[PDB]
Target: ECO RI endonculease
Amino acid sequence: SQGVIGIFGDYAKAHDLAVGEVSKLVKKALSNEYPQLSFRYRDSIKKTEINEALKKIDPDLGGTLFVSNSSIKPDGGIVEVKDDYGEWRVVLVAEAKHQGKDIINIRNGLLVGKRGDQDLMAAGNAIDRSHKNISEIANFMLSESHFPYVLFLEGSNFLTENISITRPDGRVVNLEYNSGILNRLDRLTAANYGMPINSNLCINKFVNHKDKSIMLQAASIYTQGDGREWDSKIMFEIMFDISTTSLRVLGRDLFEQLTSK
Amino acid sequence: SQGVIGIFGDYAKAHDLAVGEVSKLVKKALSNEYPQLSFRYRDSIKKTEINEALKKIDPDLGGTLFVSNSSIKPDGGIVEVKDDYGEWRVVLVAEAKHQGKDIINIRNGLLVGKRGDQDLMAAGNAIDRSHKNISEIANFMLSESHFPYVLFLEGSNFLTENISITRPDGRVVNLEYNSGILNRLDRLTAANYGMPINSNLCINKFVNHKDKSIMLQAASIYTQGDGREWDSKIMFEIMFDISTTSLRVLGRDLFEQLTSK
DNA sequence: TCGCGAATTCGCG
DNA sequence: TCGCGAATTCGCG
Model:
């Protein structure tokens, strides 16, 4: 709670900064707050890197590639920091997804459906893709104790409250939030193991079962619950919060740089 | 290696059985081989179940649902067995995916692309969806030591060798296997942590890092490497193999039923 | 070049 | 009914 983020946030709002530009601005704020630490922003990671990180855990892992310069490209990029051993440690990965143009149709008068008949459109499964990148960055961070992955959802397919949109003929159509003809929110909940959405799940839980002990890598899933678009200021504050808690977890491998610089 | 599967396999080939009907036939073979064990086949699992399995690991897990009767429906169903405590243990989950209709276009004469110009079509990312279900059944089986998930890939987007298709005008067009304009095989490799495709990865590896010890749940990804469709006999034999090794892992909780029945 | 992402309508039980 | 899956063309750097 250092005040400087109040100025940064109002900058984002004053410019309608998308997720990618907000993560770039988060890097700026971080280096402003921690001037002796070294941050950077990437817009992609190559599969070779991920595989290289994998076989460092176990020799039999990470031994596959079919397209040589294949890569993943989170539309909000990766913010990293440099630790005391010169290694780069990811402190933020962000992505922003959209589904369900229903509120647009109902705001206007366009009747959708197979025969121009429907008010609503049966929600599709495109949002299932979001699990691939989460898997990639999870495997990338399989040796870290923090998973700083933030997903930002938007659209009529991601409602957490009931909303009423009125047509150009006075017709109030109602979007019922828990309706399985619209709500695709459940399609993401496997990523944080059914832990709460709209919350920062950055620090990894360790759960057991038998002698079977294991680590969970949960993603932070945030929803514009009322159908509207995201406020860049809030989007910014969330990312700053998830990145700082990442820095808290990295605190051991950052000490030298912070005390002697 | 009990012979009976030779007859079963030739049955599948003689009928072109899709993945779902092959898994149903696998159940039949299993109960034929293990007549004192109790198997069953489901075609879906409800999110409530998955959440119920999750909070059995940790109280804070599995506490989310937005659509009440939301479910997942692997197009090859789930084969289970009943253990000595009356509990049902999944021994097989199978799914079959398709991408890249290129070999059809080149077999015929249809030039694709924005202006009816191209021989090839730039491969899309629909195959990324396959990670959701893998996540769901992984969370479902987070307390098991075996992950019996088999994925069957088919299409010009999943080639492991170079193939040559000749047009109705003598034109040999060549599909180069490691071409990143066609090959989407890398889009699955996060599921088995870069371990070998076309192999049975059913038994879970335990890898460490610090004191940080963890369990990996790797999916079996099989490819029709030469673009063609799957032979139901082989598809069958693979599923039977992955399911039996599942039974091997369950061997402790199955003893009573096998010795006293 | 090459390789990555976007998220869509609608069928089906 | 309601809710799940299918996998597609093509833009963009």
